[PDB]
Amino acid sequence: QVCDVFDIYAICACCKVESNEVFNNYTFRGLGNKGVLPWKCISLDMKYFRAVTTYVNESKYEKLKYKRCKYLNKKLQNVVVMGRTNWESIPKKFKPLSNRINVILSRTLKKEDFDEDVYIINKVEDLIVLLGKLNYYKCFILGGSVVYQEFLEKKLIKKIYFTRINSTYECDVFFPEINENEYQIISVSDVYTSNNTTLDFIIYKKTNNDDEEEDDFVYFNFNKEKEEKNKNSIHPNDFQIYNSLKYKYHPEYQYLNIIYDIMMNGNKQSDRTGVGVLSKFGYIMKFDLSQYFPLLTTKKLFLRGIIEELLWFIRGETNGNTLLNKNVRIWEANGTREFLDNRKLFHREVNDLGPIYGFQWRHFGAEYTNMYDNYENKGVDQLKNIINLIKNDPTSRRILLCAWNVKDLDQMALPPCHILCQFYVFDGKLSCIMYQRSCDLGLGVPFNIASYSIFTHMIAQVCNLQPAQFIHVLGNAHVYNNHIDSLKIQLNRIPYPFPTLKLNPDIKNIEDFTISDFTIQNYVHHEKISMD
Amino acid sequence: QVCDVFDIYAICACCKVENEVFNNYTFRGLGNKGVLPWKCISLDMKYFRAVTTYVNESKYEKLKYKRCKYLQNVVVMGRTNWESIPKKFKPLSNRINVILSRTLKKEDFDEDVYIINKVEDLIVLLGKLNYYKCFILGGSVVYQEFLEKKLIKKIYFTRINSTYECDVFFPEINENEYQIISVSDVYTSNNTTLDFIIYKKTNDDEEEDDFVYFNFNKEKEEKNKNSIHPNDFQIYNSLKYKYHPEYQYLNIIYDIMMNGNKQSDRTGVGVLSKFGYIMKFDLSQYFPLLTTKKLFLRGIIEELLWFIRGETNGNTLLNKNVRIWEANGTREFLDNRKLFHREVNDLGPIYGFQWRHFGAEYTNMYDNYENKGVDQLKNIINLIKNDPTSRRILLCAWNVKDLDQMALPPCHILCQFYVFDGKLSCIMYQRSCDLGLGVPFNIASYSIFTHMIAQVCNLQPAQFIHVLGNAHVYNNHIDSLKIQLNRIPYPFPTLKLNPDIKNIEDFTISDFTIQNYVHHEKISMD
Ligand SMILES: NC(=O)C1=CN([C@@H]2O[C@H](COP(=O)(O)OP(=O)(O)OC[C@H]3O[C@@H](n4cnc5c(N)ncnc54)[C@@H](OP(=O)(O)O)[C@@H]3O)[C@@H](O)[C@H]2O)C=CC1
Ligand SMILES: NC(=O)C1=CN([C@@H]2O[C@H](COP(=O)(O)OP(=O)(O)OC[C@H]3O[C@@H](n4cnc5c(N)ncnc54)[C@H](OP(=O)(O)O)[C@@H]3O)[C@@H](O)[C@H]2O)C=CC1
Numbered sequence A: 001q002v003c004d005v006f007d008i009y010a011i012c013a014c015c016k017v018e019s020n021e022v023f024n025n026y027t028f029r030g031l032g033n034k035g036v037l038p039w040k041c042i043s044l045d046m047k048y049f050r051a052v053t054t055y056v057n058e059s060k061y062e063k064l065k066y067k068r069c070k071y072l073n074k075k076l077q078n079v080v081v082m083g084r085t086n087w088e089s090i091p092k093k094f095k096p097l098s099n100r101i102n103v104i105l106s107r108t109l110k111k112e113d114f115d116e117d118v119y120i121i122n123k124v125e126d127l128i129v130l131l132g133k134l135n136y137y138k139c140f141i142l143g144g145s146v147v148y149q150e151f152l153e154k155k156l157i158k159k160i161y162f163t164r165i166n167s168t169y170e171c172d173v174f175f176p177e178i179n180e181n182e183y184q185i186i187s188v189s190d191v192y193t194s195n196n197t198t199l200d201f202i203i204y205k206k207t208n209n210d211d212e213e214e215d216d217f218v219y220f221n222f223n224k225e226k227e228e229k230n231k232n233s234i235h236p237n238d239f240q241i242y243n244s245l246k247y248k249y250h251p252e253y254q255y256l257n258i259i260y261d262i263m264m265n266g267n268k269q270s271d272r273t274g275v276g277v278l279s280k281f282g283y284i285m286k287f288d289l290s291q292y293f294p295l296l297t298t299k300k301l302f303l304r305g306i307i308e309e310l311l312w313f314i315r316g317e318t319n320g321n322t323l324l325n326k327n328v329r330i331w332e333a334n335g336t337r338e339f340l341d342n343r344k345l346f347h348r349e350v351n352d353l354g355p356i357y358g359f360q361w362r363h364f365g366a367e368y369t370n371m372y373d374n375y376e377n378k379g380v381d382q383l384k385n386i387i388n389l390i391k392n393d394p395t396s397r398r399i400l401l402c403a404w405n406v407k408d409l410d411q412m413a414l415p416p417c418h419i420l421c422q423f424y425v426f427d428g429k430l431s432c433i434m435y436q437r438s439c440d441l442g443l444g445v446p447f448n449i450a451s452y453s454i455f456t457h458m459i460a461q462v463c464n465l466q467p468a469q470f471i472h473v474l475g476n477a478h479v480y481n482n483h484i485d486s487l488k489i490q491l492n493r494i495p496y497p498f499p500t501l502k503l504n505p506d507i508k509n510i511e512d513f514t515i516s517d518f519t520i521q522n523y524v525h526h527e528k529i530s531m532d
Numbered sequence B: 001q002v003c004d005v006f007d008i009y010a011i012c013a014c015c016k017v018e019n020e021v022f023n024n025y026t027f028r029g030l031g032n033k034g035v036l037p038w039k040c041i042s043l044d045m046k047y048f049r050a051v052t053t054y055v056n057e058s059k060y061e062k063l064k065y066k067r068c069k070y071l072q073n074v075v076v077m078g079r080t081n082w083e084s085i086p087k088k089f090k091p092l093s094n095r096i097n098v099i100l101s102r103t104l105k106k107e108d109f110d111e112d113v114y115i116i117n118k119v120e121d122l123i124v125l126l127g128k129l130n131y132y133k134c135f136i137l138g139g140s141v142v143y144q145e146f147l148e149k150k151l152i153k154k155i156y157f158t159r160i161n162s163t164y165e166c167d168v169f170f171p172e173i174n175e176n177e178y179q180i181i182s183v184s185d186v187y188t189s190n191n192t193t194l195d196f197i198i199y200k201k202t203n204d205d206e207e208e209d210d211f212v213y214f215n216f217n218k219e220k221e222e223k224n225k226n227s228i229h230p231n232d233f234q235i236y237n238s239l240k241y242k243y244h245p246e247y248q249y250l251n252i253i254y255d256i257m258m259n260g261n262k263q264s265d266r267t268g269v270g271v272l273s274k275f276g277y278i279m280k281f282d283l284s285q286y287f288p289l290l291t292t293k294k295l296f297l298r299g300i301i302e303e304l305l306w307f308i309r310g311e312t313n314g315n316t317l318l319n320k321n322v323r324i325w326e327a328n329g330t331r332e333f334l335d336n337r338k339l340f341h342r343e344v345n346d347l348g349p350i351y352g353f354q355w356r357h358f359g360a361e362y363t364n365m366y367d368n369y370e371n372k373g374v375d376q377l378k379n380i381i382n383l384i385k386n387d388p389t390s391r392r393i394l395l396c397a398w399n400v401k402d403l404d405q406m407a408l409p410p411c412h413i414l415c416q417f418y419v420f421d422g423k424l425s426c427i428m429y430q431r432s433c434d435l436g437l438g439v440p441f442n443i444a445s446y447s448i449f450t451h452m453i454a455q456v457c458n459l460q461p462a463q464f465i466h467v468l469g470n471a472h473v474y475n476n477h478i479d480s481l482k483i484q485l486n487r488i489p490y491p492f493p494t495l496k497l498n499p500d501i502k503n504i505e506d507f508t509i510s511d512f513t514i515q516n517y518v519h520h521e522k523i524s525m526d
């Protein structure tokens, strides 16, 4: 129709508005307040805004001239169209919008009332005529709310370039509720931090409810696994949403895409119990903790439990009773009479988990007795040592913390899943590799990502550094077969911008953290899923 | 010129022919007693089908509008090439068959199978035909003539990394004339390694803009991140497709030269460092022994046999002239380690001790430790054989209790093993990686190790996976690595273990053969 010929796109930025909370895309709808934007500066958004609304491709115009000239029977700049309130919100120093053909919709104002190089129009109709008579690359509709509403209603927008600002502000004007039959998300950017907020960038698309070295590629693929003998042929129709997306650049796709590779290419193995998994061997995920806290959004996660577990580690505790009194059941099943007995630990008290994480972190090499013993200045205090190496020998390549004490494996309730952490220091920034031997992608890994990201924050802080990358190496990476249905639901959910973690900044010692020193801000998440 | 207008490509496979310098000319064996030198290499024969038959009609109009202004492919043989084909397929599964000959007239074959008089009489035949591209199938004389008359554009060169008896040879491709632009993955077919290379003759997109927008933040407007120049990675940056597994190593060198953090180390030499890489090599298809420089494996095999024995006695190696642990056992080094009461070349409770006796009290390097501490090596073998789905098959050398007693903490933290469908894969996590000197030896060490465990458990080796923690290039290695990045790998050699060996403790140095190691010349990394 008219939207494809004239390439009329919309670009906006929406925050959450003043309102056990449910989240949909309508969560991000706040456009402005008291004639201006709800927020002071979000520079990264503003820079995106300029890059998109001023970018042209010289060479591509020729074919757009042809297309548009054909329909009418007949430096390069983009057009930008804005309501009069929007235009008035711009500071003088930036009027008219640089390196762009500015247009303004208005009834109360005519050319005579503007000093500046701008086209005025009183009709949506008048714009289409204007574009007909103009050389431009792309036409972007800048808002505000009234301009957005009518260009949508009139089926005129090809794509909505949409910034999710993952914070809340007082708002008096809102973006229109986008009909999900009309527009579908096809792209989601990396998540980022700017002016103390996370944000990403998503592109909604409308529906209708030297080519010599391109042949060389087809050749170097003469030996590929065809569509039929691709191990577990699970049905396309199931992952419709996941496969529709053109760009999957949200860091959560790092987890999601491993679920997919295991489902589509995983080896079928019956395991330790006689259950059933799909397994592969050797993955890596990287998460930029300076830009976001990678708590998964495609389902709900609570961190109270796993933060209690991490504080329990740092204290050197092996006593399951301490966590159960905090109503944290993460270790309950590994602590039962039935379980300790089946691990041949007949002479071990219930909930006495033996020389596990905590004990190995503060006392590696000390003889484990029972969970009540005072092990002070017994065994190597690994945690203290790596905090000292990071502080005094930051370039050291021996800042490992290790839980896999070979000597004590059979005395633990079960060997550590999370084998070791290596630390790395450059330019006052701390990164952390964690090697995981056995990873339940379905229940375990979401939490495992959350635990070591929080741990990197804690170490970084008490060493006067800034968290950089948390790097997660998976050994045996497996999906339980009864999790498959639940994971299908999950792969078809589109990630939201990650939240942020705040550490009480008065904590200067690794031991001095307590629950209330941990605040997750702006967790926007899909609905709880039982993997069972 | 003719060869770009008409699209004349050669397509050859060359094996090796009966110390030794290597270069591309190494590969030239074309045929023997009128047939191919080798019995059957079905992957190359499959590659041959695909490349010659493939057609893309949506790029033929662009060809049609250039060709005139001057659907199948044209395939050009020579009698003895046309002849040597077994009967039951002629013509070749739907291609425009064509034969250069002198004493063969176009009468006594069909009405599709166009014969030609001379080389100059083919340009005639093409201008009057409807074909995608033109493939010279060889053999010796055909290639010679078609190359001599600068008719060939690209060359689809299959490198057969095994030696055979040959009576005919591809010509020495002039490397100021032609040059390699693509190299494929390395493969095993019919008990040889091979790869596929390409010589070129020298000189909705709504979604394509969406790509550019998503890149709006990048720290690359061209500001020289590290003092490493463009024109120096010329050959490296002048390749389109770099799918040879050795590029996994080479691309880490590149990433760390381009984007690495400038750092002091203990020695003070200066490094570029990054943090967290994976490499995967397919042990079922090759032995990943770097080809872009000479590597020797006797020492590192003795090192491994020393580990398996449980030894911590640096002298057992020194008497075999394996000097890998010489520096780490000197009086001066042990003293800087605060190991004042440790005998020279007593390396303390390192790899071998930990693998065989983890948890045992280390005394000196001559004590008897029989049946003390945990014999992890024994334990992961039983687990592999008796519980292969176990996710607990780790061999860990990093013993926190004993670190300070070791000449140095293990560079190689742990091996984790994985078993599926009678196949064994291994991950080695390396806390600290010297990419220039160390890592190439480290890849070879644990690949061999992966084979040894595989064999004694009656499994086929699959993947060796190398996780690098602190990945550093020494500032004083950068010249050498610049020379190295602009070399093009050869197809990898293979490891043959003496099959009689069935327990991990029974391998001697004799039980290890490296085969078809075709390599560039030695580099002093200094
Ligand atoms: N490895 C590879 O990539 C390939 C190589 N081969 C091997 O190559 C070997 C053959 O090598 P080679 O002896 O050179 O055979 P060729 O394939 O070069 O065949 C030579 C024949 O082609 C004709 N011919 C040669 N020169 C001309 C010319 N200038 N104009 C017209 N016709 C010409 C015949 O003339 P005349 O009529 O007088 O006989 C001549 O006998 C075999 O062992 C074969 O298996 C096989 C296929 C490809
Ligand atoms: N967060 C974001 O992405 C963006 C934020 N905003 C914010 O939105 C607010 C402004 O939006 P809003 O108040 O809805 O107003 P608009 O910016 O949409 O301005 C509407 C006005 O434009 C004129 N107009 C609009 N449509 C027509 C038409 N079809 N024909 C003629 N004149 C027309 C009229 O001007 P007149 O009164 O002269 O008749 C009308 O009152 C501000 O707070 C601004 O900062 C705006 C853009 C982007």
Ligand SMILES: CC1(C)N=C(N)N=C(N)N1OCC(=O)Nc1ccc(Cl)cc1
Residues within 6 Å of the ligand: A011, A012, A013, A037, A045, A046, A049, A082, A086, A089, A090, A091, A094, A142, A143, A163
């Ligand atoms: C900049 C902003 C809020 N972000 C996106 N993604 N898309 C928009 N429409 N934005 O508003 C731009 C606009 O129309 N107004 C505006 C306000 C101030 C200045 Cl300096 C420039 C433009």
Ligand SMILES: CC1(C)N=C(N)N=C(N)N1OCC(=O)Nc1ccc(Cl)cc1
Residues within 6 Å of the ligand: B011, B012, B013, B036, B044, B045, B047, B048, B081, B084, B085, B086, B136, B137, B138, B156, B158
């Ligand atoms: C098969 C071979 C050696 N490999 C490549 N890459 N390309 C060639 N030119 N090859 O030779 C094929 C050919 O021309 N002759 C031939 C020989 C046997 C049979 Cl079955 C079919 C064709």
